Amino acid sequence: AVKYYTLEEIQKHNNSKSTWLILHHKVYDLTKFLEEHPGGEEVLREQAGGDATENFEDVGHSTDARELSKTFIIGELHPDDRSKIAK
Numbered sequence: 343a344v345k346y347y348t349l350e351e352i353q354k355h356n357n358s359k360s361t362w363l364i365l366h367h368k369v370y371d372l373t374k375f376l377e378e379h380p381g382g383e384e385v386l387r388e389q390a391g392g393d394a395t396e397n398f399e400d401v402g403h404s405t406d407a408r409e410l411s412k413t414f415i416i417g418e419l420h421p422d423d424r425s426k427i428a429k
């Protein structure tokens with residue numbers, strides 16, 4: 343069974359103590375990845391707590407980066423919150 347989180351829940355994880363973001367409806371805990379990310383901490387920091395899909399896609403990310411992202415998945419956006427934000 344898939345763990346869901348709402349937007350309101352995710353929105354709280356917006357700082358160094360706990361940073362989550364959403365990509366393509368998956369929820370990622372990037373708390374430790376922030377200082378590993380090749381693209382730096384501040385671009386993650388600026389989108390913390392919400393959907394970052396467009397920005398992730400707009401800047402481009404390798405296949406290797408997309409495979410790496412799977413390692414930080416902690417759950418999925420609640421179905422009733424999908425109409426807000428795009429997959």
Ligand code: HEM
Pocket residue numbers: 363370372379380381382385386389394397398401402403404406407408410411414
């Ligand atoms: C869990 C999610 C993420 C993973 C694993 C990840 C991983 C990476 C990796 C491995 C690179 C090096 C280049 C590449 O392989 O394409 C990269 C570069 C970059 N990332 Fe991410 N990234 C993530 C999320 C994001 C997000 C959400 C943003 C923007 C808000 C972002 C912005 C950038 C930028 C600006 C670069 C530099 C592009 C370049 O090399 O020219 N990344 N990322």
